[PDB]
Curated annotation (Swiss-Prot):
Protein name: V(D)J recombination-activating protein 1
Domain remark text: The RING-type zinc finger mediates the E3 ubiquitin-protein ligase activity.
Domain of life of the organism encoding this protein: Eukaryota
Subcellular location as annotated: Nucleus
Function: Catalytic component of the RAG complex, a multiprotein complex that mediates the DNA cleavage phase during V(D)J recombination. V(D)J recombination assembles a diverse repertoire of immunoglobulin and T-cell receptor genes in developing B and T lymphocytes through rearrangement of different V (variable), in some cases D (diversity), and J (joining) gene segments. In the RAG complex, RAG1 mediates the DNA-binding to the conserved recombination signal sequences (RSS) and catalyzes the DNA cleavage activities by introducing a double-strand break between the RSS and the adjacent coding segment.
Family from the record: Belongs to the RAG1 family.
Complex and partners: Homodimer. Component of the RAG complex composed of core components rag1 and rag2.
Tissue: In the adult, predominantly expressed in the thymus with lower levels in the pronephros, mesonephros and ovary.
Parent-record interval covered: 438 to 522 of 1057
Amino acid sequence: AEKEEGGDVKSVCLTLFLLALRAGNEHKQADELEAMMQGRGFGLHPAVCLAIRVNTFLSCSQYHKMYRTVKATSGRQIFQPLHTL
DNA sequence: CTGCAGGGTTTTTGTACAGCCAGACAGTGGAGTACTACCACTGTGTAAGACAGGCCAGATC
């Protein structure tokens, strides 16, 4: 890190790994991994969450209720928590 | 100091071999899928005032 960046932790791990996987490759993973960080969501971008709360009329406590449920059962939580909304 | 010009630097950007796995293509017969209109039918507009005519009460003469 010192010679080529100086404190850039994320990328060194990311570029070796995605491509290392697609080395002995079935592709399946490349979709999930190429989506994984910057575009988009992964889970769902907090703006899409916010809209899907505000615009379907979910009570805050109701929303969180759902969030807990989807998180605990088979999760891999999707929805973003309240304080990040 | 500016201007451009040989080449330096490191690094891009791709082509070069050759083998190989993945998943798309195409079939099927239809499955049961997913998304579609369509059907009546709804919810939110929410309280005062002005104006005419009566006529009785009661003051004023």
